[PDB]
Design a protein around this ligand. Structure first.
Ligand SMILES: O=c1ccn([C@@H]2O[C@H](COP(=O)(O)OP(=O)(O)OP(=O)(O)O)[C@@H](O)[C@H]2O)c(=O)[nH]1
Ligand SMILES: O=c1ccn([C@@H]2O[C@H](COP(=O)(O)OP(=O)(O)OP(=O)(O)O)[C@@H](O)[C@H]2O)c(=O)[nH]1
Length: 158
C-alpha cells in the first residue's frame, strides 16, 4: 500500500477460527516462521475489502466461506527491525484485524494459487499458541489482537 506520513503501511490481518478453540496458523513461504494472513490495503480499498482480497488471494476463500465475528477498532502498529527497513520510507505497518469463523470445510482453503504464495500451507493450532510463536517484533500486536478476540472464540468452543 501507500505509506502514511508517519512511515506506516496500512495493512489488515486475519484470525480464522473454528468451533474447537483453534485458529488457522500458516507457514511463511519457504521459511520456518509462521503467522496469520496479512496484506496491504490498496488505494481505493476499505479495510474490509482488503481483508476479503487477502482471504481470496492467499487463503483461497470467499466471503461465503466465513463469517466476521469481530474486528479491532483502531490501528495496531509494529515497527520493522532497523536492519529490515529499506530506503517515502516505510518503518512498519499499521494493522486492522478481523476475526473470522470458518464455516465451509477445511478443504476449501487453498494457499498455493499465487505465483509466489504468502504461505506454504497451514494447520490448526491452540488459541494462544500464536502469541509466543510469531516473530518477536509482532508479539505486542498479536497479544492485543488475541486478547481482544479471546472471549468470542472461547464461546464457540464451549
Ligand atoms: O507442525 C509444526 C510444528 C512446529 N514447527 C516448527 O517447530 C518449532 C518448534 O515447535 P513448537 O514450539 O510448537 O514445539 P516445542 O516442543 O519445540 O516447544 P514447547 O512449546 O513445547 O516448549 C515451531 O516454532 C515451528 O517453527 C513447524 O514448522 N511445524
Ligand atoms: O517471521 C518473520 C516475519 C517477517 N520477517 C522479515 O520481516 C520482513 C517484514 O515482514 P512483514 O510481515 O511485516 O511484511 P512482508 O515483507 O512479509 O509482506 P507484506 O505483508 O508487507 O505484504 C519480511 O520481509 C522478512 O524479511 C522475518 O524474518 N520473519
Amino acid at each position: 500500500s501507500m505509506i502514511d506520513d508517519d512511515g506506516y503501511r496500512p495493512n489488515v490481518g486475519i484470525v480464522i477460527c473454528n468451533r474447537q478453540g483453534q485458529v488457522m496458523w500458516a507457514r511463511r513461504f519457504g521459511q520456518h516462521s509462521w503467522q496469520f494472513p496479512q496484506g496491504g490495503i490498496n488505494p481505493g480499498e476499505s479495510a474490509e475489502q482488503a481483508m476479503y482480497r487477502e482471504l481470496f488471494e492467499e487463503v483461497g476463500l470467499s466471503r461465503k466461506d466465513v463469517r466476521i465475528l469481530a474486528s479491532t477498532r483502531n490501528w495496531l502498529r509494529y515497527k520493522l527491525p532497523k536492519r529490515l527497513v529499506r530506503w517515502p520510507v516505510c518503518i512498519g505497518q499499521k494493522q486492522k484485524w478481523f476475526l473470522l469463523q470458518l464455516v465451509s470445510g477445511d478443504a476449501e482453503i487453498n494457499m498455493q494459487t499465487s505465483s509466489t504464495p504468502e504461505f506454504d500451507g497451514w494447520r490448526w493450532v491452540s488459541y494462544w499458541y500464536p502469541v509466543r510463536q510469531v516473530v518477536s517484533f509482532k508479539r505486542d500486536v498479536y497479544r492485543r489482537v488475541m486478547k481482544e478476540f479471546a472471549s468470542v472464540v472461547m464461546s464457540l468452543a464451549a
